[PDB]
């Protein structure tokens, strides 16, 4: 049918601030679809045509867009760019210029949905010497169609520049709605396929059994499983009840490897096909994979001439090559990390428990100088742990992953089910400006430490945390004897101190708190190094501080 629907569609959500309404009129409209359109007409409501894991876009910018709308409209870009200066909105310059050609033009036809996805279809597609201009001519070709309203969707499309107001949980929401099937069911059937077509018409038709009835399709990429952090070897060890395996967390990219036949397609943690940035390690799968339909999780990661791993950006910019190309396998080296098998042969291993997924990728991996299994520790034994701890420390990746061995694969979710154990990395350089007494056969010294950051606005010396931990004894009286001529003031077991003495301090966390004038308050600081090559005024700033905090979410 007609995207006069869709416009209308596109109108009472523009109206309207709210999104339970916008849950109704979405899903509303839903009912309102034949199966056709179903696997189409969700991406058209988010304003998209195709999922952000299709290879396919269309390639049409604004002033490419200018021309097509030109020829439709008789309007040239000179007094269309002077159109839309009015305005300030493209498609709202691309609405009005129409009628104009309302007053004007030709021929033909509504505009129904089938059409404009066909050309949609059509104008990404489109390739090569003769691409641009067929483009603009199959966009013109839509837009002598097109009513006013039509236009500017039509437009926003194009350009990605829509603003239903609709994300990917409205519509969620609405297809729950719409096909009363369960929310719940819905969730786990887009967190396995992110197809929401599929999973439109599925819900339609074959309602909540078949959406409970929804597994793996191969080359529809799933929701990567997910971490919350640990704070520690042994918290995490005990939250998974004693025992629990053990694996390194890399510097690297976290990828998906799909391989049917001799398709293979690589997925990106945001979910972009990286497959043609990577075609080495393309081949080095193929070889490296014994089944023929798998689907395995894995982290890529750069090396570097020590063979110690590059910041995984350059992973990322490895992906962002487009174009001259064997260049960049020489410039970066990668090799693939393998932690985890979704999919073998038709058998969906999601729902099955982690350690025979574990026992699946041993064996479906041919190990090869691209492509190696992770090195996995199962132990009930802390010690052993923190020493694979300290050890992907040394290397110089992140940390350490614990993952619960009766886990199945929880796509999408952040569960206690895997953990994450990582130190917090840029330490903090404060000066003392406050200390306390030691109690005990410590009462002789200070035993926690109060430490400052600079304001060069101020000159004040602005109180971050206290540090108790992370001193030997001698540390101790080493900083005692320092410290001792520097005291200005007393009063209970505190002390008041001159700003000389900087020290390297490590926290878990940065936290607001008024209890300090910094606003900022240093949770679980700890001691690490001292600086005598520093000054007061040179230590780390509460400008770097709210910056860094700024940056912790
Ligand atoms: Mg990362």
């Known amino acids: 049918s007609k995207y006069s629907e869709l416009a209308d569609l596109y109108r009472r959500l523009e109206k309207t601030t709210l999104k339970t309404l916008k849950t109704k009129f979405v899903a509303d409209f839903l009912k309102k679809t034949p199966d056709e359109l179903l696997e189409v007409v969700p991406y058209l409501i988010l304003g998209k045509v195709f999922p952000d894991w299709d290879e396919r ?35 709202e ?12 033009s030709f021929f033909s036809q509504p505009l129904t949905i ?14 090569g010497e003769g691409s641009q201009d067929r483009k603009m001519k199959y966009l013109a070709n839509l837009f002598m169609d097109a009513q006013p309203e039509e236009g500017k969707y039509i437009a926003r499309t194009v350009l990605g520049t829509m603003r239903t107001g609709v994300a990917e949980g409205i519509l969620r929401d609405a297809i729950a709605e719409a096909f009363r099937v369960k929310p719940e069911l819905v969730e786990r059937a887009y967190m396995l396929t992110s197809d929401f077509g599929y999973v439109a018409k599925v819900a339609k038709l074959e309602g909540n059994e078949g959406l409970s009835k929804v597994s793996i399709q191969i080359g529809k990429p799933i929701r990567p499983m997910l971490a919350q952090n640990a704070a520690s070897v042994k918290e995490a060890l005990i939250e998974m009840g004693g025992e629990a395996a053990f694996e390194i967390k890399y510097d690297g990219a976290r990828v998906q490897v799909h391989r049917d036949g001799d398709r293979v397609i690589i997925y990106s943690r ?29 982290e890529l990661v750069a090396v570097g001439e020590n063979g110690r791993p590059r910041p995984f950006q350059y992973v990322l910019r490895r992906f962002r090559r487009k174009y001259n190309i064997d260049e960049m396998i020489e410039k970066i080296p990668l090799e693939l990390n393998l932690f985890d098998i979704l999919y073998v042969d038709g058998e969906s291993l999601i729902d099955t428990e982690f350690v ?21 520790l199962v132990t009930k034994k802390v010690e052993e742990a923190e020493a694979f701890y300290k050890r992907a420390l040394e290397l110089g990746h992140e940390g350490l992953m614990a993952k619960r061995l009766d886990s199945v694969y929880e796509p999408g979710n952040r569960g206690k089910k895997w953990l994450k154990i990582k130190p917090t990395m840029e330490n903090l350089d404060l000066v003392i400006i406050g200390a306390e007494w030691g109690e005990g056969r410590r009462a002789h010294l200070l035993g926690s430490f109060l430490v400052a950051a600079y304001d060069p606005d101020s000159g004040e010396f602005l109180p971050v945390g206290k540090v108790g931990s992370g001193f ?6 080493e900083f005692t004897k320092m410290l001792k001529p520097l005291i200005l003031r007393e009063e209970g077991k505190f002390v008041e ?5 900087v020290i390297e ?3 878990q966390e940065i936290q607001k708190s008024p209890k300090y004038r910094s606003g900022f308050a240093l949770r679980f600081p700890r001691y690490v190094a001292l600086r005598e090559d520093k000054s007061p005024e040179e230590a780390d700033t509460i400008e770097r501080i709210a910056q860094l905090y700024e940056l912790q979410e």
Request: aromatic share 2%.
């Open 356 to 376: 025979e997924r574990r026992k699946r990728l041993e064996e479906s991996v041919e190990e090869s100088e691209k492509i190696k299994i992770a090195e996995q």
């Open 57 to 91: 876009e269309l390639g049409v910018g604004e002033k490419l867009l200018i021309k097509a709308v030109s020829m439709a409209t008789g309007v040239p870009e000179k007094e269309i760019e002077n159109s839309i200066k009015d305005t300030g909105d493209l498609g």
């Open 472 to 477: 030997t004894d001698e540390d101790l009286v």
């Open 505 to 507: 301090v490590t926290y």
């Open 497 to 501: 101190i001159e700003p000389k003495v």
């Open 270 to 298: 945001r979910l972009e096909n990286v497959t043609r940035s990577i075609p080495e390690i393309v081949e080095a799968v193929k070889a490296s994979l014994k089944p023929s339909k798998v689907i395995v999780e894995g």
């Open 93 to 104: 310059s691309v609405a009005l210029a129409l009628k104009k050609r309302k007053q004007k």
């Open 114 to 127: 089938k059409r404009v996805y066909s050309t949609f279809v059509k104008v990404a597609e489109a390739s």
